[PDB]
């Protein structure tokens, strides 16, 4: 039987792209984004525009 499909929350490598508005967390943490409707989400992909 399958008890579940579940994630692995380790950390990969880090590639310097040399841009300005690009952040990368090194350990536990999440960026907190807010939707248009007013919902709240938590993410880790850190490439932003303005």
């Amino acid at each position: 039987k399958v008890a579940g499909i579940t994630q692995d929350f380790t950390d990969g490598t880090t590639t310097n792209t040399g841009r300005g508005l690009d952040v990368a967390i090194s350990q536990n943490g999440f960026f907190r984004l807010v939707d248009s409707n007013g919902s709240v989400f938590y993410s880790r992909n850190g490439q932003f525009k303005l």
């Binding site: 579940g4 499909i5 579940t6 490439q47």
Partner: protein
């Protein structure tokens, strides 16, 4: 299945068309480079769907 593989197989062609355009335009005088950015897909289940 096949759809999850063909999604990645299709996403790895725009990411070569963009690089080929950059390589060709690397001679001009005001060109700005282009890059692509991918995101995954997730339906109501827990197994993913691709790129």
């Amino acid at each position: 299945s096949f759809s999850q593989a063909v999604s990645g197989l299709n996403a790895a062609a725009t990411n070569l068309d963009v690089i080929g355009n950059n390589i060709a335009n690397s001679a001009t005088y005001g060109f700005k480079s282009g890059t692509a950015s991918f995101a995954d897909m997730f339906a109501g289940s827990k197994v993913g769907l691709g790129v």
